[PDB]
A and B are shown apart, each in its own frame.
Chain A
Amino acid sequence: STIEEQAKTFLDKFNHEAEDLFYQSSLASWNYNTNITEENVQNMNNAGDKWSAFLKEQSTLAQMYPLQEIQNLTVKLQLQALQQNGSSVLSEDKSKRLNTILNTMSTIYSTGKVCNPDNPQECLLLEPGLNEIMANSLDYNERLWAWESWRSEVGKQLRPLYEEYVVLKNEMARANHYEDYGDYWRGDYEVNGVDGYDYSRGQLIEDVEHTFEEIKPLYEHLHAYVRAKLMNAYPSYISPIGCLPAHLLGDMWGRFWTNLYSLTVPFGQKPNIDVTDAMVDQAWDAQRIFKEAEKFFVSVGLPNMTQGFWENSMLTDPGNVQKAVCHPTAWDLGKGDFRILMCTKVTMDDFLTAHHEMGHIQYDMAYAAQPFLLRNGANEGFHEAVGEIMSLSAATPKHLKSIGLLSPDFQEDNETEINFLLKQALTIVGTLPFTYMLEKWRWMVFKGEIPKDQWMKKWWEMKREIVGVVEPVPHDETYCDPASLFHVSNDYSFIRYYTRTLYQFQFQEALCQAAKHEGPLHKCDISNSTEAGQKLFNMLRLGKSEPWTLALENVVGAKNMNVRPLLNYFEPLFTWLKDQNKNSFVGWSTDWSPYAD
């Protein structure tokens, strides 16, 4: 008779129906990604629309069960996502045009290309074509031609499409009783219903701002180290107290600095750790790469992989007859069906990638006992963070000497470890200011604090303050930098990259303290230690059924994000960068411009 009995009955039947259609919807996308056919493209749209319209029909009966009469926490969380009507709150005209803008911006990004200024006949697409050239290009003009001319036909063309994207998504949050669309992505961290563990949505703005303050002294020493290496090439354009050009960051948007690791090597007289040449002599194939990584999950106490996982894996691309996407992705269908689509070659990166791709599958096995509505990560940052901490322990020299990749006589000292910590810093340390910059810019534009004319005015102004990057050619309001980005144009969460770095280092420090490892943190290895896997398995099976602030306390003992593991793991590198930057100026100024002298 109570509402709780009626709400639980609706959730018991919905978990079965939603799980059956989601499996066929994910299976249709699997057959389309592994094989390109005219039958699979129609099955993906058919099975995709049946599952999409299924949540819309069940949302009508979900709003008829108020959460005020439900005293159960697990019931209100299952009805939290079903209470939202999605795009049904928008008007019929705005709902149909919303999917059009998303499909148009995604098509222009895929079909966009920049023709060679020297060769007007040859026109190369961005991915892979332009993304590959910008990596190894050392030329000043060649990098500027691809970087500047892209946003001319893309950033300027997507501006009227981006203006409509802001207006349509703001009307959805207003009907959902949200302050703005920027608050919608902050609702994933929302926690209510438990005394003392409540987490406000507006708290994330102060959290990412306060944790970034302690990141500055670590980032300023690394930014000055990279600038000192590239100063001798162009001393006129690159000022010691100034900022680095935007096109020289190693790729189009400057997401990762790993492309610059070649010229930034502190010591070139010492060998580097590489497992590529070691796997060639051992003669290993794609079958034993996942097999050796499966034993890594057994040594920590985690269950092994099912027979259907290794049998259904796709280990290569059979030519152009049957084409599959080589971008590594872990696809979770349902009911114990786990598959991964990746093109596996023999490289040092594919070894660490195998631990990352199998980390998502191993992560899904813990909470798989939960209902379909309760199967998910506690937030958007925990998805990729679980797979990264598995690869960090594999990249250590201790784990490489265990299975025989690295020779046991290899000398491990400060000169070898500082070279390894610098490669990870370019991917990690360089990501945090860039992710905090673009995400905070979206929150300010979606809120309305920045007029449409000041989008680019505040973009490059706040860019020299955060990441210390100035544009070689000044741009007007016609260009839009985030419009060309993969995550913004495809409507994917851009905040998950900033919080992931803080979550993965907390887990790295906690697991090494449980297994009683001594010394620096980058020397830690979680293999053969079953004590750390038991403490982590308790949180992995919770998912989002419990508050992420409560599940985080059961591992690291912290109720929020903390920079202490970020500084300690980078402490050996921070001490070396401080001594090398004494001859240079630590920090940068925002008043310097390459075209303003």
Chain B
Amino acid sequence: NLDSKVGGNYNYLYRLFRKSNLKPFERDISTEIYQAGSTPCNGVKGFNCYFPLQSYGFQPTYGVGYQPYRVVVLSFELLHAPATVCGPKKSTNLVKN
């Protein structure tokens, strides 16, 4: 109901091809052309040279299973630094005497 629009949204891309698998918690923004074989590429599309970034088709008419989902991943890591963020507290009534 938000991202998908009539005509398609090409702003959101993804990396289809990479020479190996990424390490945990790694981000690679490199746009360098992926080389499948031994044929030289040098940033020019051609035989065994493919542009890795591909587009997500976004329209409201697509099926429910393939609808894009906005995913928010919270990374919980406990380091040796002093703890700060904590859960919410609760305040009760005050009585005297």
Q: Which residues of A contact B (CB under 8 A)?
A: 1, 5-6, 9-10, 12-13, 16-17, 20, 23, 27, 61, 64, 306-308, 312, 333, 335-338
Contact = CB atoms under 8 A, between A and B. Distances in A.
Contacts of B64: 306-308, 336
Closest 6 CB pairs of A and B: A336-B63, A9-B36, A336-B66, A335-B66, A6-B37, A335-B62
11 contacts: A6-B36, A9-B48, A12-B16, A13-B17, A27-B61, A306-B64, A308-B62, A333-B61, A335-B62, A336-B65, A337-B62
Given A307-B64, A335-B63, A335-B66, A12 B17 contact: yes
Contacts of A338: 63
Nearest to A339: B61
Contacts of A12: 16-17
B84 to A, nearest CB: 44
Given A1-B38, A6-B48, A335-B57, A13 B63 contact: no
B61 A13 contact: no
User: Taking chain B's interface residues, is the majority helix, strand, or loop, or is none over half, making it mixed?
Assistant: loop
Contact of B50 (A13, A308, A336): A13
A152 B92 CA distance: 98
B54 A9 contact: no
B50 A306 contact: no
B38 A20 contact: no
A290 to B, nearest CB: 17
Nearest to B38: A1
B12 interface: no
Contacts of A306: 63-65
Contacts of A20: 55, 57
A454 to B, nearest CB: 50
Interface in B39-82: 47-48, 50, 54-55, 57, 61-66
A20 B36 CA distance: 23
Given A9-B36, A12-B16, A337-B62, 16 more contacts: A5-B36, A6-B48, A9-B48, A9-B50, A13-B16, A13-B17, A17-B54, A20-B57, A23-B57, A307-B64, A308-B63, A333-B61, A335-B62, A335-B66, A336-B64, A336-B66
Contacts of A307: 64
A225 to B, nearest CB: 49
Contacts of B50: 9, 13
B40 to A, nearest CB: 14
A61 B16 CA distance: 19
B95 to A, nearest CB: 55
Contacts of B17: 9, 12-13
Contacts of A1: 37-38
A64 B61 CA distance: 37
Contact of B62 (A5, A13, A64, A336): A336
A337 B37 contact: no
Contact of B61 (A6, A9, A61, A337): A337
Nearest to A20: B57
Given A6-B37, A6-B48, A337 B16 contact: no
B57 A337 contact: no
